[PDB]
Design a protein around this nucleic acid. Structure first.
Ligand SMILES: *O[C@H]1[C@@H](O)[C@H](n2cnc3c(N)ncnc32)O[C@@H]1COP(=O)(O)OP(=O)(O)OP(=O)(O)OC[C@H]1O[C@@H](n2c[n+](C)c3c(=O)[nH]c(N)nc32)[C@H](O)[C@@H]1O
Ligand SMILES: [Mg+2]
Lengths: 51, 729, 51
RNA sequence: AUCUAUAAUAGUUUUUC
RNA sequence: ACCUCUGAAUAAACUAUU
RNA sequence: AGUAGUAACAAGAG
């Protein structure tokens, strides 16, 4: 099996949800430092390139 | 003085002062990797492109004084153009090959010392011995092997700390060498490298080459030691084996490990023969371990192991009925055991199978720093009497005894992420994992073991969970104290009895683990695979049946009894579980007899698949079998009686029989093959007639066929998702 | 003051100077009310709190 | 019996209408 | 127009080597 | 023209 457009269909919000479930009962700082990456990825911008 | 003057010079310049002040030591690495950007994307193309240039090579500015601008033919050797981002100049490869013929000459006498590992490789190849090349059915297995042996009792981090201590004493930081191995190696290398005239960085790299272990997964056959891995391309192939022995000096621990592996294989194979003793002797005389005869090694090796001691006893040598467990030499003074696999639930919620030794037994434990007397029952420690040296020695002895006792408390004391499979999902030894886990931190084990008041007998002290010598209560059944080969006779069935007459060893006591040898084990006989691993044994057994199919078929048709008694099937029979050997043999023999009496139902592939299972003494039962198990690396791999299987799959398109993924050869169609879809060697007392027939009601299972009677046709879900019509003769 | 084996390495003049500097710092901190909070926080000092 | 050193370099793998 | 410069470095994991 | 293929090269910059 292959998956069609895995990275164009997966969402950073779902990765944030996964990280939130994984880091239950953990110190707050650890949860924050892990959560920053999905948050920044759900607000990401893409350079268009050369033109 | 020169250093401080240069630093003062750099602090006087404005930009260098800014760099030196604003850059911390942590950011020194960042500025050290700082670059304008080396636009290298296709280095092969870039090198091919640059070698067409006039000056593709950089060199220090001293080349303008060490090498002339032009040679005899006037060809230019260097130019004054500087390299980008540096003061190095641009030179031609002609400059390098001019240096190699006209440059100043220095003394290269320390090079063999600095690069001792590579010249050691050269010496090992130079003095190596080549044997014959044997074309065989190679079965390589992906395993972790060491490519750089380093030092035995060291890890990469410990080796690095030792190297830092030896070479850079004032840069070690907070590390203190704790292991006695580290202290010994540190003293040895400090003395050896005393007054050394090599650059400290080069010395550190030498010590890295000498002391740092490196292991990798490779598809390996033969020995897994470094001296054999470095020539693995030379010695092992897909269809051939090149006999070869490295010319250096062989480590003795490798010899011990390989001897244990060979002895276990030989004993296990011999247990299934008609005369185990003669088979064991003729196998030990035909076995070589790293270019050395096995009998000589047995005569000059003090290894405490059950199979090794059985091999020694078979040759009239004196044995020490001992074994090793967790760094201690155990010896059973009195008692007996029978192994039994029991599934247990670990403290960290892991399910695993542990070989449990039944019966009451007594032992003595001997270690390099501690000694103990142990009495135990089935998964229960009766008492332990340790007489170690210091606190840590007694702690280690107590931990080893607790793990050996197989106490359910010890199992439930497991915490953390303790894995019982390899990083490649290879099953590990549970006892070894428990030892390694509790030798890191045993506070929970001691806490959950319990406590017990002591009666002050003989002044033997008690011990508390935090390792203190109490006099009132101690660990449950644990007491603290203060501080030989025997002639044996071995039976026909490898039963070793002392001079008095008591049993000391037996084949059942031999470990069932199937390990691999550090040094290549060469076996010289008709079957070079007779003491090989289970995969090679299976593949070579079925290939032997395929190659000899003509006379094997004739014998099966005429005199099956002699066919079942071939010595070639015995390595196979060493893989069948002991309790099921007779049942499988009887079932397969009944299948064969029905196959003979029902003409036209002659399935060649069925006979080939089921023949090796008929080599055991038959036991007659009415149990039906849809699959027969074979032990391969600890997991029972089933061979399905009807249809293909992971172990045994026959491809009708290619007529090629593949076993465990290894080609075993191509069959040829017999004239008496049944081209009618009629099967007689699938059910013990039922003959398959055809496909689904709805007239006879619903389909039932193979395990419920006893109620059927003569001629009662029925539909059975025999095989992988198939329903067929069967009838009873 | 205390020391191992009652061994005071320096002479009593320098030790008294250290004592008077510590007394001066305590007086200055008590002049602002910070001394009580300073005293109560000593137990929770050598435990890094990741934030 | 266990067995992810650190770092550097190169190579390999990882597609909608 | 002469002249002068220049011939082009994704991510992650892994493997090999040091 | 040609290479080439979803966008370029068929010199660029000072
Ligand atoms: O590398 C493997 C092997 O070659 C190596 N080894 C074995 N012997 C030596 C010596 N003598 N020197 C150096 N190296 C040696 O150790 C490795 C063993 O691996 P593996 O074969 O997987 O383990 P093994 O099957 O030997 O089981 P193990 O856990 O190590 O136990 C060894 C021995 O102890 C017996 N035993 C355990 N218990 C709990 C027993 C018991 O309650 N009662 C009795 N009678 N015996 C018990 C095991 O069955 C083995 O006999
Ligand atoms: Mg795929």
């Amino acid at each position: 099996g292959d998956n069609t457009k895995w990275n164009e269909n997966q969402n950073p919000r779902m990765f944030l949800a996964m990280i939130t479930y994984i880091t239950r009962n953990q110190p707050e700082w650890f949860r924050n430092v892990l959560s920053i990456a999905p948050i920044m990825f759900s607000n990401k911008m893409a350079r268009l390139g050369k033109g | 003085m020169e250093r401080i003057k240069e630093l003062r010079d750099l602090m006087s310049q404005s930009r260098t002062r800014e760099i030196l002040t604003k850059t911390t030591v942590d950011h020194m690495a960042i500025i050290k990797k700082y670059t304008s950007g080396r636009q290298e994307k296709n280095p092969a193309l870039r090198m091919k492109w640059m070698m067409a240039m006039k000056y593709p090579i950089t060199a220090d500015k001293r080349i303008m004084e060490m090498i002339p601008e032009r040679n005899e033919q006037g060809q230019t050797l260097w130019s004054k153009t500087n390299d980008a981002g540096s003061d190095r100049v641009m030179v031609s490869p002609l400059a390098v090959t001019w240096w190699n013929r006209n440059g100043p000459t220095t003394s290269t006498v320390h090079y063999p010392k600095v690069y001792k590992t590579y010249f050691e490789k050269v010496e090992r190849l130079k003095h190596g011995t080549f044997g014959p090349v044997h074309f065989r059915n190679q079965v390589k297995i992906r395993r972790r092997v060491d490519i750089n042996p380093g030092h035995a009792d060291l890890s990469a981090k410990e080796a690095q700390d030792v190297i830092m201590e030896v070479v850079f004493p004032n840069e070690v930081g907070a590390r203190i060498l704790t292991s006695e191995s580290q202290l010994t190696i540190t003293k040895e290398k400090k003395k050896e490298l005393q007054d050394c005239k090599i650059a400290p960085l080069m010395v550190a790299y030498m010590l890295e080459r000498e002391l740092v272990r490196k292991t990798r997964f490779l598809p390996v056959a033969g020995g897994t030691s470094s001296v054999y891995i470095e020539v693995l391309h030379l010695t092992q192939g897909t269809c051939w084996e090149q006999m070869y022995t490295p010319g250096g000096e062989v480590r003795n621990d490798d010899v011990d490990q390989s001897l244990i592996i060979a002895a276990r294989n030989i004993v296990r194979r011999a247990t299934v023969s008609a005369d185990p003793l003669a088979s064991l002797l003729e196998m030990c005389h035909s076995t070589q371990i790293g270019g050395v005869r096995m009998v000589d090694i047995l005569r000059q090796n003090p290894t405490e192991e059950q199979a090794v001691d059985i091999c020694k006893a078979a040759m009239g040598l004196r044995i020490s009925s001992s074994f090793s467990f967790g760094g201690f030499t155990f010896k059973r003074t009195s008692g007996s055991s029978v192994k039994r696999e029991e599934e247990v639930l670990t403290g960290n919620l892991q399910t695993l199978k542990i070989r449990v030794h039944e019966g009451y037994e007594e032992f003595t434990m001997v270690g390099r720093r501690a000694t103990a007397i142990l009495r135990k029952a089935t998964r229960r420690l009766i008492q332990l009497i340790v007489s170690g040296k210091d606190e840590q020695s007694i702690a280690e002895a107590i931990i080893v005894a607790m793990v050996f006792s197989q106490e359910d408390c010890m199992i439930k004391a497991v915490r953390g992420d303790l894995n019982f499979v390899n990083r490649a999902n290879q099953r590990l030894n549970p006892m070894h994992q428990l030892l390694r886990h509790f030798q890191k931190d045993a506070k929970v084990l001691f806490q959950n073991w319990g406590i017990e008041p002591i009666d002050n007998v003989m002044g033997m002290i008690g011990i508390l969970p935090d390792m203190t010598p109490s006099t009132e209560m101690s660990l449950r059944g644990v007491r603290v104290s203060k501080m030989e080969r025997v002639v044996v006779s071995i039976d026909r069935f490898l039963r070793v009895r002392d001079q008095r007459g008591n049993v000391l060893l037996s084949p059942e006591e031999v470990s069932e683990t199937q390990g691999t040898e550090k040094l290549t084990i060469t076996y010289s006989s008709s079957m070079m695979w007779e003491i090989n691993g289970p995969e090679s044994v299976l593949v070579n057994t079925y290939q032997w049946i395929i190659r000899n199919w003509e006379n094997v078929k004739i014998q099966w048709s005429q005199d099956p009894t002699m066919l079942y008694n071939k010595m070639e099937f015995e390595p196979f029979q060493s893989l069948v579980p002991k309790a099921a050997r007779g049942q499988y043999s009887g079932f397969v023999r009944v299948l064969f007899q029905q196959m003979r009496d029902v003409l036209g139902t002659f399935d060649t592939v069925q006979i080939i698949k089921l023949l090796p299972f008929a080599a055991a003494p038959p036991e007659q039962s009415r149990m039906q079998f849809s699959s027969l198990t074979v032990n391969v690396r600890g997991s029972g791999m089933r061979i399905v009686v009807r249809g293909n299987s992971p172990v045994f799959n026959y491809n009708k398109a290619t007529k090629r029989l593949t076993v465990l993924g290894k080609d075993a050869g191509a069959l040829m169609e017999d004239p008496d093959e049944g081209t009618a879809g009629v099967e007689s060697a699938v059910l013990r007392g039922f003959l398959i007639l055809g496909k689904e027939n709805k007239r006879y009601g619903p389909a039932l299972s193979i395990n419920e066929l006893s109620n059927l009677a003569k001629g009662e046709k029925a539909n059975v879900l025999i095989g992988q998702g198939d329903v067929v019509l069967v009838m009873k003769r | 003051e205390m020391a191992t084996k009652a061994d005071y390495t320096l002479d009593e003049e320098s030790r008294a100077r250290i004592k008077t500097r510590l007394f001066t710092i305590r007086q200055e901190m008590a002049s602002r009310g910070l001394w009580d909070s300073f005293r109560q926080s000593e137990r929770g000092e050598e435990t890094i709190e990741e934030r």
